[PDB]
Amino acid sequence: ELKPTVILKLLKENIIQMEMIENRTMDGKPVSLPLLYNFNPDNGFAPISEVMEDRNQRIKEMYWKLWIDEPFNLDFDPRDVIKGKDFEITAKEVYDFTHAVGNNCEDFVSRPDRTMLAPMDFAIVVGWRAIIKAIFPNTVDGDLLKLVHLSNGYKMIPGAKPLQVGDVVSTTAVIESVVNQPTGKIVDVVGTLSRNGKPVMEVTSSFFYRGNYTDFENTFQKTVEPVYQMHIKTSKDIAVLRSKEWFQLDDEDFDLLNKTLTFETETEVTFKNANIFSSVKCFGPIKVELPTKETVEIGIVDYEAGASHGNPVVDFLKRNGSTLEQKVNLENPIPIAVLDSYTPSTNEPYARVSGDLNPIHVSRHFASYANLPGTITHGMFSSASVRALIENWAADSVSSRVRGYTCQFVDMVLPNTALKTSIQHVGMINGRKLIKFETRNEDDVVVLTGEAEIEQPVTTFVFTGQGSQEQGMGMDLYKTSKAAQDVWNRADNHFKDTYGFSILDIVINNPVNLTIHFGGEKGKRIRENYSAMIFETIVDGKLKTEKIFKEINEHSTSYTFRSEKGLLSATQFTQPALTLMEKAAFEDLKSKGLIPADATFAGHSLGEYAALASLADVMSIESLVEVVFYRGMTMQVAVPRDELGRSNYGMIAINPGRVAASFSQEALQYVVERVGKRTGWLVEIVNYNVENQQYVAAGDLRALDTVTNVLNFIKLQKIDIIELQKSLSLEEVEGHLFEIIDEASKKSAVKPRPLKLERGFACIPLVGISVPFHSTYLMNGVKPFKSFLKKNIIKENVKVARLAGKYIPNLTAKPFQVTKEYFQDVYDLTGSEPIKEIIDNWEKYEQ
Amino acid sequence: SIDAISQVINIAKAHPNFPIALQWTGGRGGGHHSFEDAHTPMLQMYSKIRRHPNIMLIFGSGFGSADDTYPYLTGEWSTKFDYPPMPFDGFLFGSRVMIAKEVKTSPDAKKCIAACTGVPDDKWEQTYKKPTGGIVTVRSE
Amino acid sequence: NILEWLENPSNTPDKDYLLSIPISCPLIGVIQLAHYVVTAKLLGFTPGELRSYLKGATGHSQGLVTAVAIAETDSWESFFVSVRKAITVLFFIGVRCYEAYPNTSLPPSILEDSLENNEGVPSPMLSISNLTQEQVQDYVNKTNSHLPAGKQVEISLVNGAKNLVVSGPPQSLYGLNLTLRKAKAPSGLDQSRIPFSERKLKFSNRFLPVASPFHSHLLVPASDLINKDLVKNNVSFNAKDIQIPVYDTFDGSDLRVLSGSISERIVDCIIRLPVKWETTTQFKATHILDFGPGGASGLGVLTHRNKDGTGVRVIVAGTLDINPDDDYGFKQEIFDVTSNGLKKNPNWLEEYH
Amino acid sequence: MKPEVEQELAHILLTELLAYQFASPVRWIETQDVFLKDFNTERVVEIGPSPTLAGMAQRTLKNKYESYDAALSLHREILCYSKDAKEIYYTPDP
Ligand SMILES: Cc1cc2nc3c(=O)[nH]c(=O)nc-3n(C[C@H](O)[C@H](O)[C@H](O)COP(=O)(O)O)c2cc1C
C-alpha cells in the first residue's frame, strides 16, 4: 500500500526541512529523520546549505528507535560492558530465521522425537541489540548513515553444545578496540552469549564510520599477541632475559638454563596522537615446557609505558623467538565444491527476523540518500547464506561440526544477484578442518571471503601391540618430521646414557648380538642401573625379589644381549621400539593439527602405554621407554628357564570358527576351562581379539597341547556343544568331554621335557612367546611393577579430562571414569588393597 | 533360454504366415540338458509368445501320462504361481517312450530304465551332484 | 501463479519447486480433470454423460480424489463445483502433508553415493521390483530394527505382484537401500551356467519422483487437521451424490457403503493407509481408461501388466503416441469410429481353450 | 568433588589398571564394540608398523555391524598409519 516517505516544507527562520520517513519500524508507528537545510537567497549560486550541527545526533536518534528497545541515552563509556537482554529461543523464531536466510538443514526443522536446534547464525539475532549499542556513545561520534560492516564471526567456546530451541540466552557485548584511522573510525565489538551461567559462544563484529577523525582521546586498542616460544640454550641468553624489567618470574632462582619458554601476551594500547601511543600495557604468563610437554606458569610479562612509540616486549620476542601459530596448512588446498547462491527479492524478510530495520536495506529513498547502488542486501544475510553452504557441503549437513565461522564483507550486493561461492579445505587447526571460501558475483567481483573450522568425523585411535615390528620401522618419518626426531632422539639419548645402547641402532639395523661395556666412570654408572633391575614376587605375604641381571656385579666388565634372529625382536627392545615409533608418529599428527579434541583411544597390551602417552601425556618420552623397557625385562624373567633357556609355557592362537561353525565363544571358554580344571594344568584365554574368530590362550605347554588336540577331536567328531547342553545335563556333557580330555592329556604328559606345540585345525602356536602373560600366572609380579609404575607416572601428569570417557583400558574394557561404580569393577577384576579402601570409604568427597 | 525363446519370436515375425513349433523343453529333460527351470521361462515369455499366431507352443520334458500333462493343457498349471490361465497346444514325450515294445532299447536296458524311481520337479536339481531317482548329470566331451 | 508459468515458460520455477506436494498435488488433479474434459467434450458428452458409461471409477494414491469427484458430476454448469471440491481437497492434502513432514537437505555425501551406485536421487518413496511382498517386508523389518519410531519405513504401495513401494524419511530409505545393495547381483551376471535353484536374486530398485512420504506414519498428524479444514470449506462427499462405484484403495470396496464420512476415508486412504492396488482393482471390465498423470509411464500400463492375460484392455487417455506391441492403446482408441477403435486383449483361457 | 582430589584418585586408578593389565586378559572384542557401537566412530585410525588391529576392526565390522551400519547410514573408515598416509594427513593425488 502507498504511504508518505518524504515531506518537504519550510520552517522558522529560513530552514528547509526534508522529513525522511521510514515506515517499516519496530511498532508499526513510522519513524522520521529530520534533515535540515539553510536557505539563503544572498548566495545565488549555492542558496541551500545543510545544518551540520547535531546532524549525527539526529541520525543516531532515528536509528535508535529502530534498533533499540530502550530510552535514547547516548551517555555510555565506550569502555563499559553492555548487558543485553535475556532471550528465549522460540520454536518459530527459528523457523522464520532458517527460512529467511535459506537454511534447509534438518537439525533446525522440527522432527518427531528430536529437539529443535538453532543455527549458530541465530547468535546475531540474540546479540544484535547488545552489540550495535556499542557504536552509539557520544565518545564514538559517527554518521550512522555512512556506517559500514567490515566483518562478523562466531566462535564456539569448546565444550559448549549448540543453541537449542529451549535455551534462555544472556548476552554481553564489550567493545574491544576503537581506533581512528586515516580513512575513518573502526569499532571492534565482542559478544558473549551465555546459557545457564556458562558462556556458550563468542560473536565478533567490526564496524566502520568513514571520515576524518581527530577523536584520539576516545580511541583505544586491545590485541592478543601470538604465543612466542623461546629456547633458552646458553648462559648469556638467560642473562639478557633477566636484563629486561618486564621479565618477572616467581622464584628468581629458577634454572632457565636448557628449558623452553612460552610468552602468552596481551597488549593494551591507548592512542594520544596520530602515530604516538599514549600508553602501552603488555602482560601475560611466562611458561616452561615439562617433559610431558605440558606448560606451567613460571612468571609474568609486565610492561607499562606512557608516551610510547612501539611495543618493546613484542619486538624482543619477535626477533628473539619463534611464533607459534595454531593453524597448519595442508600440502595442497583440496577443493570441496563451487556452489550457486542467490540474494533475496526483497530484504524485509531478513530484516524482520534479525531486527535490522536499517532503512538503507528497505527504503529506496534512504538507500539513495546514502549514495548506495540501491537497496543493498543485508551483509548479514550473505553471511548466513554462504555459511549454510559451508554447513551443507563441508560438514555434510551436520550442524554440530562447524564450531567456527568468520566473514569479510568485501563488496556490496543488490537483491537478485547470483553468487558462485567456492570452498576449499586449506589446512587444520586443533583437529578441526580449516576451510576457506570466496564468493564472487555475476561481474566476477569478490563480494565475500571468510573461513570456517569444521570438526572431523568421530575419531578413535587404536595403538598397536607387539608382533609387527619391522627393521627400520618409522625410520623414514625420522628423516622428514621434526616432531619425530625429538621423540626418538630424547629416547635414544636416555637409553645411551643409562643402559649403554642406542634404540635407534637396534631399529635401524637389527643386530644379531649386542654387548654393553662398563668402561670408565660412566661405564660403571651404567652397570649399576643394570644391577638395580629387580623382579619382586609377593608369594603368600613373602616378597621373593631377584636380580633381573643375575650376572652383572661389581666385577663385571660387560653384559651381552643375544638373539639368533635379531635383537629388534627380543621384547626388551621390541617394546621401546614400538612405543617410540608410535609416539613419534602421533606427535607428527598432533603437530599438523590433525588430532580431534574428543577422540577416544585404546591400546592392545603394549600399545596401551603408547596410547596413554600419545593422547594424555601421562609420562615423559623417557619415562615411557623406561617403563616399557622394564616391562620387557620383567616378562623375560617371570618364568623358570632351561639350560638352553627354554620355556615350560607358550601361547596358542585359536579360531573357534575353524573347529565348527557351531563352536561358539562360550564353547571355547567352556572347553578351555574344563581342560584347565581337569588336567590341573594351566590354560586361560589371554587375548579376546575378534568374536568367534581370533582368540589367544596361554599357559602350561602341556595344557596347550591338550586343548589343541581336544579341539581337533571335537571338529572331526562334529560335536555341537550348544545342542548337547540342551539334550543332556551339565554333569552329563561335563563328563562327556572330561573323557575326551583325559585321552589327550595322557598323550602330552608322556611327551619329553619342553613339549613342542604343533599346529591344529583351529590352533596355531605363537612362535616366540614363552611367558604366560595376560594370565593369572603373573599376579605375583604385580606389586613390584605397581611400585615401578608409581615411581614413573606422577600424580601431577594425570589430567583427568584427557582420560575420562576417552581412554579404554584392557583390564576393564570400559571408558575411564573416576566414579564409585568404576572403582568397584576394577576391584572385582583384580582385588587390590589401594582400591578396596577407596570403594569402601568413597565419601572422601570433601577435601 | 529366455533369450533363445525371444530369438524364436523373431524368426516368427520373420514369416508371420509360417507354422513354427516352439518346443519349450526344460532343464529336467533327458539327454542334453539345461540349467533352466521348466516353469519360470514359460511363465515369463508366454504373453509375448502368444502375440504371434504362427507359434504353436509345445510343452515338453518331465511328462509321462495324460494325467500330469493335463493341467498344462487346461492352462491351469500357471495358477499355482498366481498367473492367469496359460494353456498349451501340445506335448512331447521323450523319456516316457524309451521302454515301448518297438524301440530298439535292449531287454536289460528297458529293465534298467523302468526300475529308476523318478523324482518330482521339486528335486531334479540334485542330478548335478548325487544320483537322484537313479539319474545323474555328466558332461559330454 | 499457474497461469503465468503457462504463458511465459521463462518464469516457470524449478522442477524442485513444482514437484513439492502443496503445489504439485492440486496441479496433478487439474491435469486429470482437464483430460476428463477433452474426452467428454470431444465425444459430445456432458461430464455426467461420460460418467454414465462407466461401470465405476477408482484412483491410485491421490488419484482417488478425482474419481470420487468425477462420479458426482452431471452437467457442465454443475461441473465446476465438482472441480472445486476435487482441487480444494488436493490443495489441503498438499499443504498440510508438507507442513507435517517437509523435505530437508540431503547430506551431499549420501546423494553422491546413491548416484554412483545407479540408484535414484534419494526421496521419500523407494520402489522395489521383482521382490515378494514378503521378501521386501523382510528387508524393511531388518532396516527398521535399528531405527527409532520417527525414522521408520513401511510399505506404501503394493502396486502389484513383485512390484512394491516402501516409504519413509529419505535417509532411512537410503539405509534400506544399502542393506539391499549387498543382497542383489550385477545385472549381466550371466548365471546361465548356474543351476536355477542356486542362482542369485537379480532385482531393480530406484527412488521415485515425489517430495513427500505418502501412505506413511510421517503424515498421520496432518490427517485430523486436513479434515478439520475440509469442513471449514464447502467440501464433503455424500454417498447419495456419487453415481458410480468408487473402489476403496485399501478395502477394494465401494466408498458408498460407508457408515462415516467418505471424504474422511479417502483422506486417510491417501495419507496413512497403504494402497493394495490389485485388490482395489478387484472389478471385472473390458476396458480401463487412464486419465492419470504420465503417458505410458503412468498408472494404466502398470495395471495392464498386472492383468495381461485376462481380457482387460488398458487405454492411456492422456497421450497420443504409438505402441509397437499393441500391448495397450493410446489416446486415439477412445475416439475412433472404425472397428479399429474397438480392440480387446486376449484371454488365454478362452483363446487357447 | 575437589579437583586435586579427583586427580589423586584418578591417578591411582590409572596406575592400577596398568599394573594389573599384566595378568588380566585383553578384552579387545568388548573394546572394539565400545568405540564401534557406543561411540559410532566413523574414522578409526591405527597407529602402528602394520595394519593388524585394523583388519581386526574390519572383520569385526563384517561379522557384527553388517546391518547396524546399513540402516543407520554410517560410513565407517578404517585407516592404518602404516599404509594410509594419504587419507590421514589429507593429502591426495590430483
Ligand atoms: C536317449 C535320448 C536321446 C535324445 N536325442 C535328441 C536329438 O538328437 N536332438 C534334439 O533336439 N533333442 C534330443 N533329446 C531331447 C528330447 O527330444 C526331449 O527334448 C527331452 O527328452 C524331453 O524330456 P523328457 O525325456 O524328460 O520328456 C533326446 C532325449 C533322450 C532321453
PDB file of N, CA and C and ligand atoms in Angstrom, chain B residues 23-26 28-33 60-64 92-98, ligand 1:
ATOM      1  N   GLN B  23       8.992 -75.793 -29.426  1.00  0.00           N
ATOM      2  CA  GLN B  23       9.088 -76.837 -28.415  1.00  0.00           C
ATOM      3  C   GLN B  23       9.909 -76.359 -27.216  1.00  0.00           C
ATOM      4  N   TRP B  24       9.228 -75.746 -26.250  1.00  0.00           N
ATOM      5  CA  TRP B  24       9.853 -75.365 -24.997  1.00  0.00           C
ATOM      6  C   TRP B  24      10.156 -76.584 -24.135  1.00  0.00           C
ATOM      7  N   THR B  25      11.427 -76.947 -24.089  1.00  0.00           N
ATOM      8  CA  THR B  25      11.892 -78.024 -23.244  1.00  0.00           C
ATOM      9  C   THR B  25      12.301 -77.409 -21.902  1.00  0.00           C
ATOM     10  N   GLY B  26      12.599 -78.243 -20.915  1.00  0.00           N
ATOM     11  CA  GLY B  26      13.053 -77.734 -19.634  1.00  0.00           C
ATOM     12  C   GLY B  26      14.446 -78.220 -19.280  1.00  0.00           C
ATOM     13  N   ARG B  28      14.842 -80.394 -16.891  1.00  0.00           N
ATOM     14  CA  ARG B  28      14.636 -81.694 -16.264  1.00  0.00           C
ATOM     15  C   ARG B  28      14.436 -82.809 -17.278  1.00  0.00           C
ATOM     16  N   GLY B  29      14.820 -82.530 -18.520  1.00  0.00           N
ATOM     17  CA  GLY B  29      14.632 -83.470 -19.608  1.00  0.00           C
ATOM     18  C   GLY B  29      15.694 -84.542 -19.650  1.00  0.00           C
ATOM     19  N   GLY B  30      15.596 -85.436 -20.628  1.00  0.00           N
ATOM     20  CA  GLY B  30      16.579 -86.495 -20.798  1.00  0.00           C
ATOM     21  C   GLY B  30      17.671 -86.070 -21.756  1.00  0.00           C
ATOM     22  N   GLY B  31      18.806 -86.764 -21.705  1.00  0.00           N
ATOM     23  CA  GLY B  31      19.936 -86.480 -22.576  1.00  0.00           C
ATOM     24  C   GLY B  31      20.535 -85.095 -22.374  1.00  0.00           C
ATOM     25  N   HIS B  32      20.748 -84.368 -23.473  1.00  0.00           N
ATOM     26  CA  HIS B  32      21.198 -82.982 -23.416  1.00  0.00           C
ATOM     27  C   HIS B  32      20.395 -82.271 -22.328  1.00  0.00           C
ATOM     28  N   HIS B  33      20.962 -81.206 -21.776  1.00  0.00           N
ATOM     29  CA  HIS B  33      20.436 -80.641 -20.543  1.00  0.00           C
ATOM     30  C   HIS B  33      20.112 -79.156 -20.651  1.00  0.00           C
ATOM     31  N   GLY B  60       7.316 -79.543 -23.171  1.00  0.00           N
ATOM     32  CA  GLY B  60       7.971 -80.839 -23.118  1.00  0.00           C
ATOM     33  C   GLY B  60       8.843 -80.988 -21.888  1.00  0.00           C
ATOM     34  N   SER B  61       9.267 -82.226 -21.609  1.00  0.00           N
ATOM     35  CA  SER B  61      10.187 -82.550 -20.505  1.00  0.00           C
ATOM     36  C   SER B  61       9.516 -82.828 -19.147  1.00  0.00           C
ATOM     37  N   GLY B  62       9.643 -84.062 -18.673  1.00  0.00           N
ATOM     38  CA  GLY B  62       9.139 -84.429 -17.361  1.00  0.00           C
ATOM     39  C   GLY B  62       7.777 -85.094 -17.390  1.00  0.00           C
ATOM     40  N   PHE B  63       7.236 -85.272 -18.596  1.00  0.00           N
ATOM     41  CA  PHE B  63       5.888 -85.814 -18.775  1.00  0.00           C
ATOM     42  C   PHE B  63       5.878 -87.297 -19.120  1.00  0.00           C
ATOM     43  N   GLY B  64       4.815 -87.979 -18.714  1.00  0.00           N
ATOM     44  CA  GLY B  64       4.729 -89.408 -18.933  1.00  0.00           C
ATOM     45  C   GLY B  64       3.328 -89.943 -19.129  1.00  0.00           C
ATOM     46  N   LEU B  92       5.369 -83.083 -25.827  1.00  0.00           N
ATOM     47  CA  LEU B  92       6.304 -84.093 -26.320  1.00  0.00           C
ATOM     48  C   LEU B  92       6.794 -84.981 -25.190  1.00  0.00           C
ATOM     49  N   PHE B  93       6.966 -86.262 -25.515  1.00  0.00           N
ATOM     50  CA  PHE B  93       7.344 -87.287 -24.550  1.00  0.00           C
ATOM     51  C   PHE B  93       8.599 -87.998 -25.020  1.00  0.00           C
ATOM     52  N   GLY B  94       9.707 -87.684 -24.365  1.00  0.00           N
ATOM     53  CA  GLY B  94      10.994 -88.206 -24.770  1.00  0.00           C
ATOM     54  C   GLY B  94      11.313 -89.456 -23.998  1.00  0.00           C
ATOM     55  N   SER B  95      11.438 -89.315 -22.687  1.00  0.00           N
ATOM     56  CA  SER B  95      11.799 -90.445 -21.851  1.00  0.00           C
ATOM     57  C   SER B  95      10.696 -91.493 -21.821  1.00  0.00           C
ATOM     58  N   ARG B  96       9.452 -91.053 -21.620  1.00  0.00           N
ATOM     59  CA  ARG B  96       8.315 -91.964 -21.438  1.00  0.00           C
ATOM     60  C   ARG B  96       8.256 -93.109 -22.461  1.00  0.00           C
ATOM     61  N   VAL B  97       8.789 -92.875 -23.653  1.00  0.00           N
ATOM     62  CA  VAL B  97       8.657 -93.839 -24.744  1.00  0.00           C
ATOM     63  C   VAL B  97       9.791 -94.885 -24.834  1.00  0.00           C
ATOM     64  N   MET B  98      10.865 -94.681 -24.068  1.00  0.00           N
ATOM     65  CA  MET B  98      12.103 -95.463 -24.199  1.00  0.00           C
ATOM     66  C   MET B  98      11.966 -96.931 -23.835  1.00  0.00           C
TER      67      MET B  98
HETATM   68  C1  LIG E   1      18.122 -91.046 -25.185  1.00  0.00           C
HETATM   69  C2  LIG E   1      17.732 -89.613 -25.605  1.00  0.00           C
HETATM   70  C3  LIG E   1      18.217 -89.075 -26.993  1.00  0.00           C
HETATM   71  C4  LIG E   1      17.838 -87.610 -27.444  1.00  0.00           C
HETATM   72  N1  LIG E   1      18.305 -87.101 -28.784  1.00  0.00           N
HETATM   73  C5  LIG E   1      17.946 -85.709 -29.224  1.00  0.00           C
HETATM   74  C6  LIG E   1      18.398 -85.184 -30.584  1.00  0.00           C
HETATM   75  O1  LIG E   1      19.170 -85.988 -31.463  1.00  0.00           O
HETATM   76  N2  LIG E   1      18.001 -83.787 -30.970  1.00  0.00           N
HETATM   77  C7  LIG E   1      17.166 -82.909 -30.039  1.00  0.00           C
HETATM   78  O2  LIG E   1      16.791 -81.595 -30.377  1.00  0.00           O
HETATM   79  N3  LIG E   1      16.719 -83.457 -28.685  1.00  0.00           N
HETATM   80  C8  LIG E   1      17.113 -84.820 -28.291  1.00  0.00           C
HETATM   81  N4  LIG E   1      16.640 -85.331 -26.950  1.00  0.00           N
HETATM   82  C9  LIG E   1      15.808 -84.451 -26.116  1.00  0.00           C
HETATM   83  C10 LIG E   1      14.321 -84.923 -26.259  1.00  0.00           C
HETATM   84  O3  LIG E   1      13.901 -84.824 -27.608  1.00  0.00           O
HETATM   85  C11 LIG E   1      13.379 -84.023 -25.430  1.00  0.00           C
HETATM   86  O4  LIG E   1      13.714 -82.660 -25.647  1.00  0.00           O
HETATM   87  C12 LIG E   1      13.530 -84.427 -23.947  1.00  0.00           C
HETATM   88  O5  LIG E   1      13.898 -85.796 -23.894  1.00  0.00           O
HETATM   89  C13 LIG E   1      12.174 -84.308 -23.232  1.00  0.00           C
HETATM   90  O6  LIG E   1      12.480 -84.538 -21.886  1.00  0.00           O
HETATM   91  P1  LIG E   1      11.830 -85.849 -21.143  1.00  0.00           P
HETATM   92  O7  LIG E   1      12.649 -87.160 -21.726  1.00  0.00           O
HETATM   93  O8  LIG E   1      12.007 -85.742 -19.689  1.00  0.00           O
HETATM   94  O9  LIG E   1      10.224 -85.917 -21.544  1.00  0.00           O
HETATM   95  C14 LIG E   1      16.982 -86.719 -26.521  1.00  0.00           C
HETATM   96  C15 LIG E   1      16.489 -87.253 -25.108  1.00  0.00           C
HETATM   97  C16 LIG E   1      16.872 -88.691 -24.669  1.00  0.00           C
HETATM   98  C17 LIG E   1      16.386 -89.188 -23.296  1.00  0.00           C
END
